[PDB]
Amino acid sequence: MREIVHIQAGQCGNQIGAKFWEVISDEHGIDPTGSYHGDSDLQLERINVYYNEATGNKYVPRAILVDLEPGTMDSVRSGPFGQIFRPDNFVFGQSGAGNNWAKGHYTEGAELVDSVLDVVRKESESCDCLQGFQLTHSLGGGTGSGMGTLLISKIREEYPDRIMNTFSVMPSPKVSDTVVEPYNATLSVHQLVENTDETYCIDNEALYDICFRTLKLTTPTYGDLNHLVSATMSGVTTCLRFPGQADLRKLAVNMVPFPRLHFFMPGFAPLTSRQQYRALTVPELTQQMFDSKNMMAACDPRHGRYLTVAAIFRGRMSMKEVDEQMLNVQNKNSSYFVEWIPNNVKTAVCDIPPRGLKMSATFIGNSTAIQELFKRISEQFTAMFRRKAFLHWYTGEGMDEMEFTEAESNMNDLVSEYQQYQD
Amino acid sequence: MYTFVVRDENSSVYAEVSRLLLATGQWKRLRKDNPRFNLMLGERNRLPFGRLGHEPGLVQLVNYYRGADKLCRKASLVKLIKTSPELSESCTWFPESYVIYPTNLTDEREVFLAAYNRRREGREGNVWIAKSSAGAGILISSEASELLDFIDEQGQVHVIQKYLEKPLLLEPGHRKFDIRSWVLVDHLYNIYLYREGVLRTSSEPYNSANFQDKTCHLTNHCIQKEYSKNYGRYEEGNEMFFEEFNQYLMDALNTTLENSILLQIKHIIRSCLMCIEPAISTKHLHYQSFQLFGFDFMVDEELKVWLIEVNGAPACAQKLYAELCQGIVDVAISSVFPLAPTSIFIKLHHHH
Amino acid sequence: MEVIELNKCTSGQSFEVILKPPSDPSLEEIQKKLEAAEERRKYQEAELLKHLAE
Amino acid sequence: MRECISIHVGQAGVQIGNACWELYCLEHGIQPDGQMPSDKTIGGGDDSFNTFFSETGAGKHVPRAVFVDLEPTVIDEVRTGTYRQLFHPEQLITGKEDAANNYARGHYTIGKEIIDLVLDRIRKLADQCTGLQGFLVFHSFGGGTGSGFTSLLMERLSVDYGKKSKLEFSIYPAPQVSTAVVEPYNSILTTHTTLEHSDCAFMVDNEAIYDICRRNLDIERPTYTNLNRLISQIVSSITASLRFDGALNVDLTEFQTNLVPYPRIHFPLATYAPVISAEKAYHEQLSVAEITNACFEPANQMVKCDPRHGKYMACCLLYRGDVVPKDVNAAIATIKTKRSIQFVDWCPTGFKVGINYQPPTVVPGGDLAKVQRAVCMLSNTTAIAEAWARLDHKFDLMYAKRAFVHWYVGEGMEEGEFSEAREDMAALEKDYEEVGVD
């Protein structure tokens, strides 16, 4: 009984988190009312990892919904699986965060953080053996970014020896709500460097390009982008939710050779456009899974090197054929894998495929190429900070320019740290 | 796409093989410390055989046979011939040799003196040569006192073997020579002899009354090109090839290279490699080995072939680099890693 | 090729064939290592909490 | 009769322990409910099988075993499996969260809190022994429990049972059946702190067991069940002398006397033959010479290496089935004249031979086929040092960059313990070279 506590904060965080529970609920056979209706015992074997068991064989997700405005979480509650979430687990304010990290981290967020921790403490107290936490949020807004990282700092204080895992949507100018997103992202990235064991980097530009060039969606919507995140979140957590020949701490021990370089690039395959019925072969599944176009951090892996790689194959397939194709990609591109971590490419199989797919593959890479992402954010940050543009939104909340200069240096440090291991 | 590493930057042979491998567009070179390789062109000394054949999904091949040093070491070869029943002590194609350790360190000193005194008493030619693997350091003399006293002044094991006092002399010139034969042994332990050999000839007339000046006694390519004043006189680079040498054996001796010499060389090569096969074969090993060998022979005036030594990291004559190196890629590397004639070798069939 | 020490019973036998002749930390110290590591964990955790308090 | 207590630490040890006791019961005719019809001494007796089994008044034959794991999922199988009835709850110890493949975590963080409980349970089994010989410890190198907690348990056992022998069955890490990148760290850490506490260690390389299962049993992708059933066969062959009437390797001391002349070099190489697929139409039964000759084929060794380029210090031939000394000696003569077998000059060129007339027992419905005669050779070659070399090289690759070291330091381990443990291995490799190479 290795329970995980799930938290979703802010607009992006609650919308992506909502679809996530919708996706995995279908996989485990939990209907929108929390009643099981599957046909395999594999669906319930690891069910207590994300679900609490209530009276009458009901399964209630172990999730806490958090926001500084009611709007999004009202949509969640009215959504399809809205009734599945614990009504107590809705914690929200009325002020909003105005896409302001300072409002989420110091002012508006600070007034509400204690009540969120009261719900977290309640869910952890009823865990037989709590693995750790996972947070879904964006870094470009105010609540998920500012208050999300505030929650992490306070959760690590109360649970210092638990694993802290996040799914973090990185802002992109091509899919942008406000011009201050590089400010909020740089401020959050330093928090994650300090207070997370694993962070799954999700670039909204990668999701957009994938929806446009690959999926062939003329005008992608946030809904379309979230379908990709839902699929990917389901793939990376397959190790945790189903029986297989792994706990968060074990995953971290094999993915993180250095404490600060714990930012992962996820990947998914297939990514087909509506030729959608064609069977996908193991070689095809592998070739796409490692293809940059299939990756969601918007970083070319052929610009850096892989410290560690974890691939998860789902569905009934030839495990011998899986090993042959994986060992073929390494032995055909070993120049992009660091040679001082022997066997840094692992592979796992799962017999239950996603909904509507004969077999899929999910990619988890700890690549030094991730530095290009932080580089983009840093450049966009300095483009404005050098002119102190838009700072008044943050200084009016109590912040000082110094805190910005330090976040600027902290991120540039992070880039230099990735750079040394790339050579 | 196959992958290979290069761990011996000084090998002229595999420098060309690597150049040929990349010219096919189907072989990729990795850093010398990358373990995910199919082929390793390994180092000469302390090659880490123990780390080969442990990569999941990789068939790995190395250009050296672990344990072949028993054959390519001066004292090792002597001990191997004297202790192996397949070769026996009465080996008719290997000069009477003895392993002698300097007195500052089993040893065959007394056994050598016994056979030495017998020759001295029987009016027989008693000229021996003392050499070692640590030389560029060779001494030729008919007095055992000088041979032994020369080894003690050194600090490494040496070998004293009978000096061929009646070598076959090429004319014109009256000059000594040795024969280099390149042999390739693949992973299946097929023994392939390169059809092209080289005679490394002495450009100085053979003088049996003065072993002090070793220019006409040592046919080494470096000794002739450094201390010999007639280098390149009769043949380019003191290197006569088989076509010319066979034509000479016909005009002068009314015989051929195949009958008078090559049959003995092929017999010697089989006997040596078949002997150690059970000890170095990789037939049931988790990795595969192949290796190029350099056999050096001497021919006496009776047209009897003698084995001098075997080289485990041989070089090749300039004119034969392209042909032989390509041949290595064909039967040793591509036979294990195929790509997407009239063979240049001579298969010496044998019982495994 | 000599056989020595032939022992036979109802469920088997054993013998030796010769082909050629020849030619701690105390309990106190273990507890110190354990407690020393526990002290280094406590110190690091304290610095983490000290960091979070700032 | 003197008792032997088996201890199973971590997932590998527990599952391999489950497979061995399954075999022990089939071999001694013990049913899943612990009853043994052939035992005419009810509730007692000092027979050879009593070295591994105690007896209750009700006639139940209970293994002298303890299972330890920092997580319950693996030991719960034993509790609810076929032989659930054999053991009682005191024998099975399970924590609630494992060591995360972290040696420091299993040895220090978690080990400190559970060591005294394990010792208490082991003492309970010891108190039933009238003359305990020592312990057999089953564990993996790569697991955080198998590596980290085993080395702590071995340090305390030497304190609490100073005069007792301690043998190991250790699982050498193989990438083909591992998802952990830090196993070279754990292996070297546990070999360092366990070296002076173990009198004899039988290493099994999963890579070797893996290929034997694909090659001989024709299993394209072997599972841990396939691996463990084959490993328990070798373990059975090694411990048979302790559980059956005999005169060779009759107690744990004899293992060190017969196999380990120099203390630090206590890692014998195991070679087993034949391994025939039960799915075969029907196999030709191999002779004494044929199976004996197979003991010098790398394909049947529990650790892939080349004994032709090492030196033997000892050599045992353990036969099971239709075998007579006349045939063993005949095959031995034939192998010397054909094989490269070089002993050290300070050891005799000989072979200790044991023959048990009962042929190998195969688990019904398993993968192995019934054979009329089998043999396990235990030889102490310097060639097994190839295994330490491989492992030490992987260690060096990561440690040069300090990759993953923070996980260990974070559990209270000092970084200097890495280099200390690595120099010990470097010295162990130098010991082998001094003994085997000229």
Ligand SMILES: Nc1nc2c(ncn2[C@@H]2O[C@H](COP(=O)(O)OP(=O)(O)OP(=O)(O)O)[C@@H](O)[C@H]2O)c(=O)[nH]1
């Ligand atoms: N032969 C065999 N090897 C196993 C088995 N289980 C695990 N292993 C090997 O053991 C290594 C992993 O260590 P584990 O024993 O699983 O870890 P542990 O001892 O339970 O310690 P933790 O880290 O706390 O889980 C890998 O190399 C596996 O291949 C098994 O049942 N049979």
Ligand SMILES: Nc1ncnc2c1ncn2[C@@H]1O[C@H](COP(=O)(O)OP(=O)(O)CP(=O)(O)O)[C@@H](O)[C@H]1O
């Ligand atoms: N017993 C012997 N009788 C006559 N000549 C001999 C001899 N032993 C060596 N030589 C001469 O020495 C030369 C080669 O010596 P040797 O081969 O032992 O040294 P080396 O190994 O440095 C040369 P390489 O390795 O290229 O064959 C030959 O040209 C040969 O003429």
Ligand SMILES: Nc1nc2c(ncn2[C@@H]2O[C@H](COP(=O)(O)OP(=O)(O)O)[C@@H](O)[C@H]2O)c(=O)[nH]1
């Ligand atoms: N992928 C994805 N990104 C989103 C979504 N909604 C907002 N974002 C991104 O998140 C950032 C804005 O953060 P937001 O969640 O709205 O701020 P918050 O509500 O205060 O936490 C911008 O970079 C948006 O592009 C969504 O539904 N999906």
Ligand SMILES: O=C(Nc1ccccc1)Nc1cccnc1
């Ligand atoms: O120009 C401004 N900031 C700036 C300019 C250059 C460099 C750094 C900072 N601020 C401003 C301008 C006009 C009204 N109010 C404020």
Ligand SMILES: [Ca+2]
């Ligand atoms: Ca307020």
Ligand SMILES: [Ca+2]
């Ligand atoms: Ca009894």
Ligand SMILES: [Ca+2]
């Ligand atoms: Ca002891």
Ligand SMILES: [Mg+2]
């Ligand atoms: Mg918004």
Ligand SMILES: [Mg+2]
């Ligand atoms: Mg030479």
Ligand SMILES: [Mg+2]
């Ligand atoms: Mg475990």
